[PDB]
Amino acid sequence: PSSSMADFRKFFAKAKHIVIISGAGVSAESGVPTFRGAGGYWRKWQAQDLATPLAFAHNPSRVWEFYHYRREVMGSKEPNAGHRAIAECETRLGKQGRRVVVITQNIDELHRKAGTKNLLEIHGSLFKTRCTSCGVVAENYKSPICPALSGKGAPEPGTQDASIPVEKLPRCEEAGCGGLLRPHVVWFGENLDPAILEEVDRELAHCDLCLVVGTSSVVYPAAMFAPQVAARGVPVAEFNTETTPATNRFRFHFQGPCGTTLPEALA
Ligand SMILES: Nc1ncnc2c1ncn2[C@@H]1O[C@H](COP(=O)(O)OP(=O)(O)O)[C@@H](O)[C@H]1O
Numbered sequence: 278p279s280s281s282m283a284d285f286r287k288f289f290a291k292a293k294h295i296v297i298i299s300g301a302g303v304s305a306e307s308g309v310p311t312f313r314g315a316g317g318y319w320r321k322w323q324a325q326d327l328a329t330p331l332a333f334a335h336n337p338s339r340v341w342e343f344y345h346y347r348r349e350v351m352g353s354k355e356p357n358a359g360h361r362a363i364a365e366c367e368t369r370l371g372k373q374g375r376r377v378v379v380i381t382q383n384i385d386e387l388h389r390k391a392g393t394k395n396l397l398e399i400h401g402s403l404f405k406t407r408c409t410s411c412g413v414v415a416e417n418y419k420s421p422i423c424p425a426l427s428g429k430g431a432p433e434p435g436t437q438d439a440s441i442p443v444e445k446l447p448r449c450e451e452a453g454c455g456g457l458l459r460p461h462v463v464w465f466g467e468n469l470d471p472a473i474l475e476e477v478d479r480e481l482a483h484c485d486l487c488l489v490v491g492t493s494s495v496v497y498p499a500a501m502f503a504p505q506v507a508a509r510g511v512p513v514a515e516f517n518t519e520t521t522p523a524t525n526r527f528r529f530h531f532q533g534p535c536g537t538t539l540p541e542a543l544a
């Protein structure tokens with residue numbers, strides 16, 4: 278792939294509908310713990326262990342403890358120069374009648390915090406709940422999400438499980454339900470929301486420029502959004518610290534932290 282910023286800029290100057298696919302590398306730059314790698318653990322598990330239907334079915338209290346800790350740490354995390362360059366790009370181009378949409382795998386909402394309005398969160402959000410009984414989804418920013426989780430979630434190895442009884446975990450407040458809430462986060466092995474995927478497909482079909490930023494490009498189906506785009510001949514530019522298996526399928530590859538490359542690319 279090419280590494281010509283000048284050539285990318287020539288495409289960027291002309292594009293009227295830009296799709297920006299963002300992955301955990303954008304969150305990593307804000308110091309947000311991903312628990313994916315390389316040895317990133319919460320006390321004795323990683324995200325592969327706890328972000329699963331299995332985990333929630335065996336030990337919903339431990340899963341909530343994990344997500345509680347992640348909700349709490351967000352209070353000390355802020356968007357980085359990558360988030361901000363993306364948000365400013367959307368607002369600036371919007372004035373010119375040009376569309377910028379962010380499709381993010383990230384659940385930390387930092388794109389929103391930076392000001393992005395046109396955002397598809399394909400894996401959910403740490404700050405939404407879903408009721409396991411009625412299915413209602415709701416925004417929830419409360420610290421702590423429930424009284425039993427106050428002071429819990431500590432990440433140090435050896436920390437005892439809170440072992441909160443399921444009736445003291447977050448419960449649905451819909452009249453007559455009272456069911457157990459889960460984080461509204463897509464877990465490994467679960468299907469993504471068809472309506473969101475319908476929106477994703479509409480943007481991919483109409484864009485004339487596509488950026489893939491901070492993404493390892495092995496998690497499906499998100500690792501197959503950009504190939505469909507390049508097939509129509511639209512340029513795909515990758516911003517990542519390392520080549521991925523999907524690198525040689527892109528028009529541009531700009532190595533380095535996306536907070537360093539994006540402000541120049543989107544200026
Ligand atoms: N600071 C960064 N700037 C751009 N890309 C990054 C940065 N840090 C990590 N990356 C890349 O982000 C990707 C992380 O992938 P992963 O942890 O699987 O999350 P995702 O499933 O969202 O891709 C890897 O390609 C990693 O090299």
Ligand SMILES: [Zn+2]
Nearest residue numbers: 408411449454
């Ligand atoms: Zn309910």
